[PDB]
Amino acid sequence: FRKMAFPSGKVEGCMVQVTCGTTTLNGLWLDDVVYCPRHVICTSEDMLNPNYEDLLIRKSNHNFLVQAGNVQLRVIGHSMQNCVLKLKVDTANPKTPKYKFVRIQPGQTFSVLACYNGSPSGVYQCAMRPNFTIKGSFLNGSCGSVGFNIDYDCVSFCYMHHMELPTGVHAGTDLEGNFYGPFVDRQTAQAAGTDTTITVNVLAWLYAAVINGDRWFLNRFTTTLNDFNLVAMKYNYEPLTQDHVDILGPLSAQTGIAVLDMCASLKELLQNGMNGRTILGSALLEDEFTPFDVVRQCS
Amino acid sequence: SGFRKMAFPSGKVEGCMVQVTCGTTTLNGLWLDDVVYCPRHVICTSEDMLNPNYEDLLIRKSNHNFLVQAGNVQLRVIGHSMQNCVLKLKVDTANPKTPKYKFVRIQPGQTFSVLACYNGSPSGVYQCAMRPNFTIKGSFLNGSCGSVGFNIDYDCVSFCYMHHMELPTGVHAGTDLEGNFYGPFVDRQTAQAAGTDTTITVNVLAWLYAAVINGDRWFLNRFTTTLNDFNLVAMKYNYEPLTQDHVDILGPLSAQTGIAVLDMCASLKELLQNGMNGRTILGSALLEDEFTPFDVVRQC
């Protein structure tokens, strides 16, 4: 049971390189529009208190260098949609797949195609943390990297990398320029909130362990929704709602274990530890597997 | 901090995956040029797997008995031959999506990306390492036979693994692209026991060197140990013994830093006897052994 990422083939053909002056980052080429973070028009000295609306007036179409491999894309128009620049190019991308722009909620998972200078280099699976950050691997030049989910024939773009916080975490926006979290696209001291463990994802992971035959944390006891949240709040676990119980329905029928019955096992794990044992070969509880991910990978 | 286990982009490999059907069995195949590669047990039923006579089974088959399907376009099989444990199906049309490719055989401890496919359709990609017992610990359901492992260097794809069998212990076994099995495993439905799995010591040391470069230093100690003494302690924790070749590979890591290889071994020895004590190294609460030294000194 590994953390698999979606195939990146449909996304690799849409990555381009956007250059404005000295700054170079990655862009998303869909149809005849190139999407990239709006701070590409700002120098290192302009990131203190940038005025994007005034800076964009200065720039023209010939100040943007869009490169797709060996070919050069010619910019004929520019626009801004919140914290995202929309560059209109003269040629449509023939590699454009069936796509859709969606905004996800914290706790959901998606695959990230890390790119450098418009060239994909790696792909990995991650989840949106409750503090609206992601524990990704972004170095310098990886701005503009996109996160996506893959339907049967449709690619849902949900994230674009914008900034790197001074803690190893990264922050970004959706494809419409709306930031995930209280962050702003400026070079200043920005603090991420207290990260909490995704309780619903842990329960789904525990169901996956039961499917794989690893059944030792199961106990005869059961708890209430209110009692579990009291323990969950103490151990920095997000509160469990009724909709979370409904989502875990398909996994409850396959294993025969009720959600509240499983919560008693998780409650004992937090208080008494792992008792020197492993679940699915791990000494810690994974919280980056959504209930939908468990169904996809198992049933 | 932060060191993600990243997998190579799979775009160049997605266009080479096909579906091969022989009778009732259906698995995945690799379409390169005018040759389709797939495990040879596709011509075996569930009853023949106990004692398969592949020479007897293959001679009774014809070209029209193999159904090769790349999406909706059906390929025409014009010939076939068997190389060790792999089947080579020659088709009438070459694959226009064929990239610059190579066939390499890897040693235990090396890492590669795996593209999991079901009935010729890719489903997911993950990064793994060849364990010292010549097995891989991934997610392979029924119908994933034929999925390949690869590495990408610049623009060249290096195919190194093809999934063949799933062991009763939950691990998977396979061959290289020439049909030679990794380990003593065979393509039979018999009781095959994998060896004891051990931690890749050289990968852990390379990972620890990346930690001191990135900031973490709490595990360093003032002691040093000999290579012979370290192995006597390492074997007690099911750690692979360290050879002189591993020391030379870690040379550049000890050059950028100030810590000798034997110095780092003493620190690793102290970590094993004490544990993490609630602390983390590069954001990880466990010692990682799936990062090769080559990857460590490229992305420092």
Short mmCIF file of C-alpha atoms in Angstrom, two decimals, chain A residues 75-288:
data_model
loop_
_atom_site.label_atom_id
_atom_site.label_comp_id
_atom_site.label_asym_id
_atom_site.label_seq_id
_atom_site.Cartn_x
_atom_site.Cartn_y
_atom_site.Cartn_z
CA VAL A 75 2.49 37.27 -26.34
CA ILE A 76 -0.31 39.38 -27.84
CA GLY A 77 -2.15 40.31 -24.64
CA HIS A 78 -1.92 40.21 -20.87
CA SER A 79 -4.43 40.27 -18.02
CA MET A 80 -4.59 39.64 -14.28
CA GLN A 81 -7.16 37.56 -12.37
CA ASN A 82 -6.36 38.11 -8.67
CA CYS A 83 -2.82 36.72 -8.11
CA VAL A 84 -2.39 35.14 -11.58
CA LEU A 85 -1.21 36.59 -14.90
CA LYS A 86 -3.10 35.49 -18.02
CA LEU A 87 -0.90 35.82 -21.12
CA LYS A 88 -2.64 35.47 -24.48
CA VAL A 89 -0.41 33.80 -27.06
CA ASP A 90 -0.74 33.64 -30.85
CA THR A 91 -0.88 29.83 -31.09
CA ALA A 92 -3.20 27.37 -29.36
CA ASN A 93 -1.69 24.37 -27.61
CA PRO A 94 -2.46 21.14 -29.54
CA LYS A 95 -1.64 19.15 -26.38
CA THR A 96 -4.55 20.72 -24.48
CA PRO A 97 -6.55 17.98 -22.71
CA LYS A 98 -10.06 18.07 -21.29
CA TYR A 99 -9.48 20.21 -18.20
CA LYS A 100 -11.42 21.99 -15.47
CA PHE A 101 -10.60 24.58 -12.80
CA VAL A 102 -11.71 23.58 -9.30
CA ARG A 103 -10.98 24.72 -5.75
CA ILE A 104 -10.34 22.02 -3.17
CA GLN A 105 -10.84 21.94 0.62
CA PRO A 106 -8.15 21.23 3.24
CA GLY A 107 -7.59 17.52 3.77
CA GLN A 108 -8.02 16.59 0.10
CA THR A 109 -5.21 15.02 -1.91
CA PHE A 110 -3.74 15.82 -5.32
CA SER A 111 -0.62 15.20 -7.39
CA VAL A 112 2.01 17.90 -7.96
CA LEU A 113 4.22 18.11 -11.06
CA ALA A 114 7.37 19.86 -9.87
CA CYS A 115 9.01 21.73 -12.75
CA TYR A 116 12.13 23.84 -13.26
CA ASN A 117 12.36 26.40 -16.09
CA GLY A 118 9.35 24.85 -17.80
CA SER A 119 10.71 21.28 -17.68
CA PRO A 120 9.01 18.64 -15.50
CA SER A 121 11.42 16.90 -13.14
CA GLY A 122 9.27 14.96 -10.70
CA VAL A 123 5.78 14.13 -9.47
CA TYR A 124 4.48 13.26 -6.01
CA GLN A 125 1.23 12.90 -4.07
CA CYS A 126 0.36 15.29 -1.24
CA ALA A 127 -2.59 16.61 0.75
CA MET A 128 -3.72 20.14 1.53
CA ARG A 129 -2.89 20.61 5.20
CA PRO A 130 -5.49 22.19 7.51
CA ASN A 131 -3.27 25.30 7.73
CA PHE A 132 -3.62 25.73 3.92
CA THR A 133 -0.03 24.63 3.26
CA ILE A 134 1.59 21.63 1.57
CA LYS A 135 4.68 19.66 2.59
CA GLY A 136 6.15 19.62 -0.90
CA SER A 137 9.64 19.71 -2.41
CA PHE A 138 10.07 23.04 -4.21
CA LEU A 139 13.45 24.65 -4.89
CA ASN A 140 14.26 27.96 -6.56
CA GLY A 141 12.73 28.17 -10.02
CA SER A 142 9.83 25.83 -9.19
CA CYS A 143 7.26 28.64 -8.93
CA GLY A 144 4.25 28.06 -11.16
CA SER A 145 4.22 24.30 -10.62
CA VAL A 146 0.66 22.97 -10.72
CA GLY A 147 -1.26 20.43 -8.68
CA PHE A 148 -3.97 18.35 -10.29
CA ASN A 149 -6.41 15.48 -9.96
CA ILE A 150 -7.25 13.16 -12.86
CA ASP A 151 -10.79 12.06 -13.64
CA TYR A 152 -11.34 9.23 -16.12
CA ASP A 153 -10.80 11.63 -19.04
CA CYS A 154 -10.66 15.08 -17.39
CA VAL A 155 -7.77 16.77 -15.58
CA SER A 156 -8.84 19.02 -12.69
CA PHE A 157 -6.29 21.74 -11.94
CA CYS A 158 -6.57 22.90 -8.33
CA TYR A 159 -3.24 24.42 -7.23
CA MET A 160 -0.35 26.58 -8.40
CA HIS A 161 2.82 27.11 -6.37
CA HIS A 162 3.49 30.75 -5.50
CA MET A 163 5.69 31.12 -2.39
CA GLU A 164 7.88 29.11 -0.01
CA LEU A 165 7.46 29.77 3.70
CA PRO A 166 10.57 29.80 5.95
CA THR A 167 9.58 26.46 7.50
CA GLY A 168 9.82 24.02 4.57
CA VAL A 169 6.14 24.37 3.67
CA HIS A 170 4.82 26.04 0.52
CA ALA A 171 1.76 28.17 -0.22
CA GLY A 172 -0.13 28.85 -3.41
CA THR A 173 -3.41 29.69 -5.12
CA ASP A 174 -5.96 28.03 -7.34
CA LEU A 175 -6.04 28.65 -11.09
CA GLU A 176 -8.36 31.64 -10.56
CA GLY A 177 -5.76 33.43 -8.40
CA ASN A 178 -7.46 32.88 -5.03
CA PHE A 179 -4.92 32.15 -2.30
CA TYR A 180 -5.14 29.10 -0.04
CA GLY A 181 -4.81 30.64 3.41
CA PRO A 182 -4.10 34.08 4.86
CA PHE A 183 -0.92 34.46 2.81
CA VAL A 184 -0.19 37.31 0.39
CA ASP A 185 2.26 37.36 -2.52
CA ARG A 186 4.84 39.61 -0.88
CA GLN A 187 8.32 39.07 0.57
CA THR A 188 7.65 39.45 4.30
CA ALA A 189 7.43 37.48 7.53
CA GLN A 190 4.41 35.20 7.05
CA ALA A 191 3.56 32.58 9.67
CA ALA A 192 1.66 29.37 8.99
CA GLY A 193 -1.03 28.32 11.43
CA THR A 194 -0.91 25.40 13.84
CA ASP A 195 -1.00 22.27 11.70
CA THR A 196 -3.49 19.59 12.76
CA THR A 197 -3.81 15.93 11.83
CA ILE A 198 -6.54 15.03 9.34
CA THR A 199 -8.64 12.70 11.50
CA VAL A 200 -10.92 11.48 8.69
CA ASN A 201 -7.93 10.45 6.56
CA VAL A 202 -6.41 8.51 9.48
CA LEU A 203 -9.63 6.52 9.92
CA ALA A 204 -9.70 5.71 6.20
CA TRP A 205 -6.08 4.56 6.45
CA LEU A 206 -7.00 2.32 9.39
CA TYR A 207 -9.74 0.74 7.27
CA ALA A 208 -7.14 0.04 4.58
CA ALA A 209 -5.01 -1.78 7.16
CA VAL A 210 -7.99 -3.97 8.07
CA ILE A 211 -8.49 -4.78 4.37
CA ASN A 212 -4.83 -5.85 4.15
CA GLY A 213 -5.41 -8.25 7.07
CA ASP A 214 -3.54 -6.21 9.71
CA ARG A 215 -6.19 -6.37 12.45
CA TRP A 216 -4.73 -5.87 15.93
CA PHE A 217 -5.86 -2.38 17.01
CA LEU A 218 -9.51 -3.50 16.92
CA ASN A 219 -11.24 -3.58 20.30
CA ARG A 220 -14.67 -4.42 21.69
CA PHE A 221 -15.28 -0.83 22.84
CA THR A 222 -17.09 1.99 21.07
CA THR A 223 -17.30 5.73 21.71
CA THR A 224 -19.57 8.65 20.89
CA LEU A 225 -18.89 11.47 18.45
CA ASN A 226 -18.69 13.99 21.30
CA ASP A 227 -16.35 11.90 23.46
CA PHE A 228 -13.91 11.21 20.61
CA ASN A 229 -13.68 14.89 19.68
CA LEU A 230 -12.69 15.66 23.28
CA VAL A 231 -9.70 13.34 22.90
CA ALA A 232 -9.15 14.47 19.30
CA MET A 233 -9.00 18.15 20.27
CA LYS A 234 -6.46 17.44 23.02
CA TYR A 235 -4.09 15.61 20.65
CA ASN A 236 -4.36 18.24 17.87
CA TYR A 237 -6.77 16.18 15.77
CA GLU A 238 -9.48 17.92 13.78
CA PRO A 239 -13.06 17.43 15.03
CA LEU A 240 -15.08 14.68 13.38
CA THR A 241 -18.40 15.66 11.79
CA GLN A 242 -21.39 13.58 10.73
CA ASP A 243 -20.49 14.03 7.05
CA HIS A 244 -17.14 12.39 7.81
CA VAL A 245 -19.03 9.33 9.08
CA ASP A 246 -21.13 9.28 5.90
CA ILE A 247 -18.05 9.35 3.65
CA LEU A 248 -16.55 6.36 5.51
CA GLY A 249 -19.70 4.36 4.71
CA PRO A 250 -18.36 2.30 1.79
CA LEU A 251 -15.27 1.37 3.82
CA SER A 252 -17.48 0.37 6.76
CA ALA A 253 -19.51 -2.10 4.69
CA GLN A 254 -16.44 -3.74 3.14
CA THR A 255 -14.79 -4.36 6.52
CA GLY A 256 -17.89 -4.61 8.72
CA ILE A 257 -16.50 -2.13 11.28
CA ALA A 258 -18.57 0.88 12.30
CA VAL A 259 -17.08 4.38 12.29
CA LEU A 260 -17.64 4.89 16.02
CA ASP A 261 -16.22 1.43 16.70
CA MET A 262 -13.10 2.39 14.72
CA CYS A 263 -12.85 5.71 16.58
CA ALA A 264 -12.44 3.77 19.83
CA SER A 265 -9.36 2.06 18.37
CA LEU A 266 -7.93 5.41 17.24
CA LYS A 267 -8.67 6.88 20.68
CA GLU A 268 -6.65 4.10 22.31
CA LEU A 269 -3.80 4.57 19.82
CA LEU A 270 -3.38 8.25 20.72
CA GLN A 271 -3.48 7.68 24.49
CA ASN A 272 -1.51 4.43 24.86
CA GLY A 273 0.69 4.79 21.78
CA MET A 274 1.46 1.97 19.37
CA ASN A 275 2.61 -0.39 22.17
CA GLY A 276 5.79 -1.04 20.19
CA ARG A 277 3.91 -2.24 17.11
CA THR A 278 3.47 -1.20 13.47
CA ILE A 279 0.41 -0.60 11.29
CA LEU A 280 1.08 -1.26 7.60
CA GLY A 281 4.79 -1.18 8.44
CA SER A 282 4.63 2.35 9.88
CA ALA A 283 5.08 3.44 13.49
CA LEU A 284 3.10 6.65 12.85
CA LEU A 285 -0.45 7.28 11.65
CA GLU A 286 -0.69 8.49 8.05
CA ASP A 287 -3.18 11.27 7.31
CA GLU A 288 -2.64 11.83 3.56
#
